[PDB]
Every structure is written in C-alpha cells, then in structure tokens.
Amino acid sequence: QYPIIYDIRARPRKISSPTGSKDLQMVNISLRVLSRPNAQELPSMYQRLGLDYEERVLPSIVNEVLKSVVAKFNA
C-alpha cells in the first residue's frame, strides 16, 4: 500500500479568456475560480488528476463552461 499524493487543495485559479459572446468582441473574461478535487469520490483520481490537477484540468473545464455561459450571448 504505497502512499498516494494529491494535496486536495482549493486554489484561486485566475482564468482569462478573450471570448466575446454570441457576437464577436474582445471581452477579458476574468474568472478567479476557487476549486478542489472530488475528495468524496475515489482514489483513481491519482491516475487522471494526480498532482497540480487544478491548473492541469480545471482551466480547460472553465473554458468550456464560460463558452456555455458567455459565448451563448451572456456578455
């Protein structure tokens, strides 16, 4: 049973995307997202998330999300 390292930590990831909205525009979408990993689920995260998963995976997620919100005309 070798130790697994996660550092299950809430980081304030400053995210910046120029995405306009439904229309085109230079909109500096600054989202400082304070976020953790799913400590309530299961150890397999180590294979996928491992360490420094915050800036690893979550800044891609936030880009998809801000598109589903901002790029749909919200801004």
Binding site: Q1, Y2, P3, I4, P43, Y46, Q47
Partner: peptide, 30 residues
Amino acid sequence: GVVNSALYNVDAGHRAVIFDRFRGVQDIVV
C-alpha cells in the same frame, strides 16, 4: 536498491511494462 532493481515499480497506481531486449514491448498488464 533491489526494491526497484529486482522488483518492478510496484507502488500504488503504477505500472511497469516489460520491454524485452530481444522481443520488444511485451504488451502485458504487468
């Protein structure tokens, strides 16, 4: 020492696939 020379990288979540010097990548779950 032998913990990783004689024994594979058997640490939780890790895998160490057999590259056979004389046959190539032994595509085996090991």
